[PDB]
């Protein structure tokens, strides 16, 4: 189902694409998996522990 | 974990990667060749090493 949904969205089946470094600007040797992930902001702040 | 992965990745060999079998006069031009993109990182080459 993930593969069909990626095909529907005009995205690679394997789920990885080639990225270019922001500093030097050349394509990385191997495809790198990139997608959207649900991050969380935990209560362990840094100024509360400083 | 990261240092060993990088060193393992770049101390490899492939059968027909790029610029295989070419002879180089030192590690300096090996680095310049890799940076210019004319030679792959895993390429069986002959290098004069002191």
């Amino acid at each position: 189902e993930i593969k069909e949904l990626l095909k529907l969205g005009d995205l690679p089946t394997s789920g990885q694409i080639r990225l270019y470094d922001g500093r030097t600007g050349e394509q990385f040797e191997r495809p790198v998996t990139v997608g959207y992930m649900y991050m969380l902001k935990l209560n362990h702040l840094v100024d509360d522990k400083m | 974990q990261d240092v060993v992965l990088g060193l393992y990745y770049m101390t490899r060999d492939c059968v027909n990667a790029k610029g295989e079998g070419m002879v180089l006069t030192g590690p300096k031009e090996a680095e310049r060749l890799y940076r210019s993109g004319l030679a792959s990182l895993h390429a069986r080459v002959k290098v004069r090493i002191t």
């Binding site: 840094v46 100024d47 400083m50 | 990261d2 240092v3």
Partner: protein, 51 residues
């Protein structure tokens, strides 16, 4: 007041003045090591990955 002079004094107060770093629990003798401080804009202790 945190004037500029206090930082101009700090950058040379810390230099060549080692500072110990401790990570509880200190299982062995290596849990305490001394590092030469470097001043950073931030809030977290930057640690060398090799240690």
């Amino acid at each position: 007041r945190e004037e500029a002079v206090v930082w101009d004094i700090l950058d040379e107060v810390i230099r060549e003045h080692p500072v110990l770093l401790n990570r509880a629990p200190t299982l062995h003798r290596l849990g305490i090591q001394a590092f030469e401080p470097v001043l950073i804009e931030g809030k977290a202790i930057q640690l060398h990955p090799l240690v």
